Scaffold this active site. Structure first.
Site, PDB file in Angstrom:
ATOM      1  CG  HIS A 272       7.658   4.825   1.030  1.00 20.05           C
ATOM      2  ND1 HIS A 272       7.121   5.879   1.738  1.00 20.05           N
ATOM      3  CD2 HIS A 272       7.767   3.801   1.909  1.00 20.05           C
ATOM      4  CE1 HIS A 272       6.938   5.514   2.995  1.00 20.05           C
ATOM      5  NE2 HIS A 272       7.320   4.257   3.124  1.00 20.05           N
TER       6      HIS A 272
ATOM      7  CB  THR B  26       1.442   5.577   3.890  1.00 23.55           C
ATOM      8  OG1 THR B  26       1.574   4.225   4.342  1.00 23.55           O
ATOM      9  CG2 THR B  26       0.829   6.418   4.996  1.00 23.55           C
TER      10      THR B  26
ATOM     11  CG  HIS C 112      -0.235  -0.009   2.531  1.00 24.15           C
ATOM     12  ND1 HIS C 112       0.553  -1.069   2.925  1.00 24.15           N
ATOM     13  CD2 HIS C 112      -0.206   0.880   3.552  1.00 24.15           C
ATOM     14  CE1 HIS C 112       1.041  -0.829   4.129  1.00 24.15           C
ATOM     15  NE2 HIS C 112       0.595   0.346   4.533  1.00 24.15           N
TER      16      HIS C 112
ATOM     17  CB  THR D  78       6.852  -0.521   2.832  1.00 23.42           C
ATOM     18  OG1 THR D  78       6.551   0.815   3.255  1.00 23.42           O
ATOM     19  CG2 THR D  78       8.065  -1.037   3.594  1.00 23.42           C
TER      20      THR D  78
END
Ligand code: 5GP
Ligand code: 5GP
EC number: 3.1.4.-
Lengths: 830, 828, 279
Positions: free
Chosen positions: A792, A715, A713, A794
């Site tokens: 970003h 953020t 996902h 992760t």
């Protein structure tokens, strides 16, 4: 910055020095921006947009059309001031020396025997005020004239008390060839002459602080203006003077008695102006040559009455060739009288001639007394000699430069002076005044009290910023005054020195943040010049006597992109970036390392979050014409007109500028950056959700990299809210649902974001992120964090090597809002 | 300046920043000059002659062919050093930081755990020496490579005793973005590598003065070169040291023991080179990692025989994988031995471990002694620990930077050392040396005595100019040497200060006139770079740490126009005259007023006296690559311009006046010194008391004249009667040329109070050619004042009048006795 | 300005350097004025008016009676701060180096293995705060003690992160001999210790702005005082910090864990003082 636009069909090519070439048909404001960032002196414009020329001229950058390449183009290899409203070109160029000539602004000089003392064969040719009579020399597509004159040299010779003119002129000319062009002095003549009429017409009450002798002619037609200068020399102040005897010092080889006469009469005119705001009748006794009237008449029409046995050419009406003795009743009630009576240098002994002249002096003084005793609203000035005599204590003393310093002075008397206490003055005190004092200024008005005035338009062109003036009073004047034009020193010094000076004469120095002006334009001489319809060939050098110009209560404050804009913000940035730097990416590189974004510096030339602020902080000595504060404020209240930039974007550049200044040990830029960051945090009440409870997350369908976590996902937001605001957040999300799915999400590589964090870049989402930050902040919802936002996905909590792929679009599958540390998602729009 | 030449096919134009454009095919050598006088950094050359591109490159100005606008053009918007002989481009550009990488030129570094201490995700990428492995990255019309590396940071970190590498690298990277590019540092790395091989081949005997650790690898292949450095630390000098105890200071987070080993071996190699001028065999014991061999082998081939237990170095011919104890006879007679005995520790007591290390050290020392007892040509280096021990007095002590300061040092031993006095050294003194000294330089050679050597090619690359060296010894070396390349600091100070310095480190400063070289080129780094086949994209800034380069006895001295030429004489002159100046005519105006030509400023855009020298004097801090001295001399004794000597003197006087007005004390001195040099090279005489004169008479005079005999006084001379015939010869020698000149007049002016004359044009060049002919023939011609060609019209003090350009009759030319009715010649 | 008044009968004469001589019996305030206008460093007062000594002392000029010429006089060839109300003499003098010793204000240092890292044979001897335990060395007509200590050097070494103590101490001692005496620093210790008790007793509420670590001991007994210094390092401010790994830097050769402990506890004491004005 001398931008010259020539026809594209006639795109003539020569290797002129410091030239450049630009042309484009994409936008009209960004062609002006890109031109403003070119590094050379001259720019050649080939697609020649009239709009873009107007934009440049509004910014102060000279931008003119060239149609006669053969002579228009070549005769513009010199600097000039351009009145772009009237399309007039004032050349400041001393090539006319090749004609063996000296150029003056004043007609009277042509009648003196000055040409004899020049170099052999040289002449002096009158050119008119700012070269008005030179328009015949240049017949171009525009009105053209050469504003350059050698009048500075002549005036310096008159005040220098050195005798030999030939060597003086030669030395000063050689010096003029050895030093750079006095642009400020020459263009300020044009600026004064254009500025003050506009102010008198446009504003009710105009106050000018600290006029100097240079602009003595400027205000001849404007008695509405109230002037404040240094105090006058009063008779009562002669008590301090030590007694002296006759001293025959010769100051000029050619007779300058007419300059003395003119300065006397003009001083009297301005005293009358100060008392009664109207133009007086001028009465003159003596003053037989009187040529300088011409030079006065060029600025204002006056009514002149002359009494002299010889003829007076330019007088309005030479009332009587006969001498004036008891004709007092002819003199009208609203006037000034100049009494320059010298009987004659008889061929008798000097003692006998002295008695003759002394009796004549008493006669002149009594004549003045009778003049002023009968009638209200009049002023007078008399020629007296050094002797024992009883003058009124409040009378004003004049000793302007004359040919020889030989026992003569002048007394300026108003009607308040006549019936005042009179004091006995010895010849020694008057001789001491004649020998030790030369009147520096024709403006004898009381000093200006630095207080805000509510009914006045205050004009402080070069007077307030001085060592002895109260600094805090200056700051309060600039801060709290309406309708003003005030100038201060810039503080372009490193180490943040609060004063700057030359030979024990110092000036206060200010930064643009040292003021807290509400509604004002704080720009350069270029910017202020543009605001009043002028542009200039030559910008301010970073190290010099550079001044901030502050316009309070101006029409132009809200025209952000029009006046005092970001033209030339990157001129110096670009020169440094492409010539000297270690890499052209250094800027984006440093800005990312300064905001602790070193985790990846990979291709940060794209989607960096820093702004204009970096170049307005670092290169302020070059681009201080920008008015960074107004740029920040006007974008605070849309009322982001072109940019719509989040405030954190501004703060990041502030932090980068602070780190840069510490690395360069530039103490001034360090202060300026800290103060601008403070101003930003004052204008925006920023909040940071450093301890978040909820977050906004985007989820993607495909992941072009190997991922080791269960849920990939992005953020996309982090916020701190009470439960009750979840609907508000949701509404705001819906407010841009279209936009949220519209963005072209792309990823190209993976990198390590921190120890034990391995992520994939996300690109193209940051602009949308800032729009949404603005919406959350406007809605009083705490959004964002103290750190910089790094979009970003992760991929793993493992230490893995970096991998690159071709640009692969990513597709959104849901945009959810989830409670941090809760598996509970509280919204999921698709 | 980057001069980039684009073909008519690639005539595409964009608005690149700081760009410029030039192109022409109506001039030959002036295309290069006019390019050299342009103001910006990058220039685009469009109708380009290959010749002028070559001329620029010979002058030091980088000039490159550009064909791939898409990539090659965009990727040459950064500075570089260009080998125009082999057509290779060395980029100095640190944009590679965008790859999250640190670049090193050294392979051994890649084997350490350095990547762990970098910023997260960053890598260290080995690049070739001067970026040899980057040629793959660039596919252009030319060979292209990026010489920029981050070795500055790594080396400084090792020598700065800073602990944490991550912050250190980050700080230094930010600093690198905030300060301008270290071009001298980066391009001199290229210049050394091209220079010294050329010198070894081209010259017999090469002496290098004061090499530093930066060029440690460069001389690995040239034992022919004899180098002189600051000197070694002898055991004899340990008597001064105060006794100290073990202090375990940590210097690097990652193991740099290989750097210590390599520096030790290289120091030993250069010592061997110093003693016996030939390359040795390398023997090593211990040395388990063995990679730095690779980095050494890249510059010179050596024969590596290592003894290492159960471990295998990189390219060492492994004479045995077994431990080495008493195999002394295996070691040849022309060799070097490095005794780094591993000395592996364990989990035993530190005191017992200390005794273990002490015994092992004694074993190593005896090993070295046995090595050196025999052999005619050997040198050896041994690893010892801090203890009481008896070392040779003349032995050399080495402590190169290592990971931790842990009671270890190295001893360098000659064959001469074994047969020398031995002295007892206590453990405290050894600890003091380990703790307070780190060896700065691998060249431990005795200092250079500043005396001229007649058979040697001396190379003093940034070594001689210094506060402590004898200044007059330096001047005599430069002046009287036959074959040298020496660099000094240039006196770019406005006040004539003879020193310049920072934080108590000062250097002597010289002007080009401070020397008296016979046949030598005194030019800038750019000029010297051009002479050796290199050019550079950007010239030296005027107030930097700029050095004068002096090349004694070169083939190129007589090739005036090719090397150390007048490229860039007017770059700053032209920028100032346009732009900021009061007037575009300001230059000519000032030179005419300073030489008392103020009578008229009309005829001065045309036919002004010298200004080639003017811009070489006053703007010298910019164009000090010109070598004005050789330019003046070579024109005294032909070996083109045909410039009169007085023409140079006038520019000298004008520069003196300018300097006095600007209070530029250095330019004032330099101008006076050049005027002195001019009057030295030319034995000038002036006919201030005239004896005879040359006069020209014309029939047409477009103005009213009030004098009886109108003539142009074309000459003034002081001669004996016996020389009257010879003068005539010279007149006849150019009689045709004298009538050939297209003499024109355009206006009338005042030459002095009570003198009214008409200007004359087109006769001045002929006047100078004739002045040269008179001076060569030892006939006194001309006057102290400047020559003003004019036809006196009246003594009436009249106003100036102008007319269209009117040619002149030249009815007669003649030589007449001054104040005499006697004319002594009158040719048709 | 070191005015020393000695008995007129015992008007001993030596050619000390920078000395002067004054004495008169016309007025008591104008003898002080005329003394105050003498040009040298040391003044010798022979008619020795007690009134005039008091006037000088009120002006800041040290004025003390000398009764043991043999040792009192010669052991005052160095600068000092004089508490003229209590008649106490605090010598700021580093001649004690001739005893091969380093002097400290703090007892804990004596328990560390610091003496090993000194120069050979050197010791460090505790002297008490402003040399209170040195009063045995000097037994004069007045209470006398040597307030000079080498504690500045030790603290600088602790904060300097350089390792080798032997060279550090040697360098700093050589520097101390090469530069003039740090009078301001040394006499301000005495001034702080005398000043703040007087203020706490004499005034209701005392606010001290910007205390530095030097006077950390001064306010230990005065929780009434409210202190204002630079802000504290909060946990929330660690968000700005860049992540790092273990780095083993050694700063001192001898164990200074006790200095850490003491600074910790004193910091806590002053935080408590700031919140609740009680010990
Ligand atoms: N983030 C941000 N960058 C800007 C802005 N304006 C110009 N820039 C950047 O600044 C560059 C030019 O300035 P320089 O970095 O060369 O000083 C542009 O290429 C652009 O990337 C802005 O408003 N915001
Ligand atoms: N280089 C050079 N320039 C000269 C010479 N004589 C006159 N000049 C003039 O000097 C100019 C060079 O720039 P300056 O500094 O004089 O403006 C040339 O454009 C040219 O017109 C000469 O002998 N050599």
């Amino acid at each position: 910055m001398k931008v010259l636009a020539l026809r594209h069909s006639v795109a003539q090519v020569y290797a002129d020095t410091q030239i450049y070439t630009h042309d484009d048909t994409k936008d009209s404001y960004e062609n002006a921006f890109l031109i403003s960032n070119l590094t050379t002196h001259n720019i050649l414009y080939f697609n020649y947009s009239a709009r873009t020329l107007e934009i440049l001229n509004k910014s102060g950058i000279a931008a003119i059309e060239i149609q006669s390449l053969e002579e228009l183009f070549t005769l513009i290899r010199c600097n000039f001031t351009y009145d772009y409203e009237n399309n007039v070109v004032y050349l400041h160029d001393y090539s006319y020396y090749t004609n063996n000539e000296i150029r003056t602004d004043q007609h009277w000089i042509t009648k003196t025997n000055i040409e004899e003392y020049l170099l052999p064969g040289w002449k002096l040719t009158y050119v008119g005020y700012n070269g008005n009579d030179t328009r015949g020399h240049y017949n171009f597509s525009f009105t053209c004239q050469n504003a350059a004159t050698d009048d500075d040299i002549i005036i310096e010779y008159i005040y220098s008390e050195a005798l030999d003119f030939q060597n003086f002129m030669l030395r000063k000319i050689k010096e003029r060839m050895t030093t750079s062009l006095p642009i400020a002095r020459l263009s300020n003549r044009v600026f004064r002459d254009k500025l003050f009429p506009l102010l008198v017409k446009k504003h009710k009450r105009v106050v000018n602080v600290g006029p100097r002798n240079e602009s003595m002619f400027t205000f001849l037609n404007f008695p509405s203006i109230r002037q404040f200068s240094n105090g006058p020399y009063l008779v009562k102040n002669t008590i301090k003077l030590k007694q002296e005897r006759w001293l025959g010092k010769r100051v000029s080889q050619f007779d300058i008695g007419q300059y003395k006469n003119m300065l006397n009469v003009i001083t009297t005119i301005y005293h009358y102006y100060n008392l009664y705001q109207e133009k007086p009748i001028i009465y003159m006794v003596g003053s037989a040559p009187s040529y300088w009237i011409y030079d006065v008449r060029q600025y204002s029409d006056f009514l002149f009455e002359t009494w002299d046995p010889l003829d007076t050419p330019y007088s309005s009406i030479h009332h009587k060739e006969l001498f004036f003795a008891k004709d007092i009743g002819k003199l009208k009630d609203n006037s000034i009288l100049y009494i320059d009576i010298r009987t004659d240098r008889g061929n008798a002994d000097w003692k006998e001639w002295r008695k003759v002249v002394e009796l004549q002096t008493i006669s002149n003084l009594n004549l003045a007394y009778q003049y002023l005793a009968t009638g209200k609203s009049k002023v007078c000035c008399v020629k007296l000699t050094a002797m024992d005599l009883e003058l009124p204590v409040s009378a004003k003393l004049l000793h302007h430069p004359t040919t020889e310093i030989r026992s003569e002075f002048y007394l300026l008397l108003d009607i308040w002076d006549v019936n005042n206490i009179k004091r006995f003055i010895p010849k020694g005190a008057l001789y001491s005044f004649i020998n030790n004092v030369i009147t520096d200024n024709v403006f004898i008005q009381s000093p200006f009290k630095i207080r805000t005035s509510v009914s006045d338009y205050i004009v402080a062109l070069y007077a307030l910023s001085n060592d002895f003036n109260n600094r805090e009073d200056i700051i309060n004047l600039i801060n709290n005054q309406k309708q003003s034009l005030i100038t201060v020193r810039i503080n372009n010094t490193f180490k943040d020195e609060p004063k700057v000076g030359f030979k024990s004469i110092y000036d206060w120095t200010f930064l643009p943040t040292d003021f807290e002006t509400t509604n004002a334009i704080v720009t350069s001489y270029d910017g202020c010049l543009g605001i009043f319809g002028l542009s200039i060939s030559l910008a301010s050098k970073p190290t010099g006597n550079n001044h901030l110009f502050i316009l309070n209560g101006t029409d132009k404050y809200y025209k952000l992109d029009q006046f005092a804009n970001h033209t030339g913000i990157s001129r110096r940035s670009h020169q440094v970036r492409f010539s000297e730097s270690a890499t052209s990416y250094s800027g984006y590189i440093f800005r990312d390392l300064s905001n602790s974004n070193f985790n990846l510096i990979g291709t940060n030339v794209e989607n960096s979050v820093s702004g204009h602020v970096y170049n307005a902080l670092i290169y302020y000595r070059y681009n201080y014409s920008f008015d960074l504060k107004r740029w920040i404020y006007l974008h605070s209240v849309e009322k982001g007109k072109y940019y719509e930039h989040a405030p954190i974007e501004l703060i990041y550049a502030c932090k980068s500028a602070k780190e840069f200044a510490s690395l360069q040990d530039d103490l001034t830029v360090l202060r300026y950056a800290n103060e601008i960051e403070n101003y930003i945090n004052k204008v925006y009440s920023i909040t940071y959700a450093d301890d978040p409870n909820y977050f906004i997350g985007i989820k993607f369908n495909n992941i072009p990299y190997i991922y080791d976590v269960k849920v990939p996902h992005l953020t996309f937001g982090v916020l701190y809210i009470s439960d009750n605001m979840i609907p508000d957040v949701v509404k705001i999300m819906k407010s841009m649902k279209q936009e949220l799915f519209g963005m072209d999400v792309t990823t190209s590589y993976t990198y390590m974001l921190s120890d034990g964090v391995y992520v994939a870049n996300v690109s193209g989402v940051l602009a949308t992120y800032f729009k949404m930050y603005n919406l959350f902040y406007k809605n009083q919802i705490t959004f964002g964090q103290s750190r910089m936002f790094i979009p970003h996905i992760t991929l793993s909590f493992s230490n893995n090597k970096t991998v690159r792929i071709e640009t692969t679009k990513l597709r959104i599958k849901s945009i959810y809002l989830r409670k941090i540390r809760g598996d509970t998602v509280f919204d999921m729009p698709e």
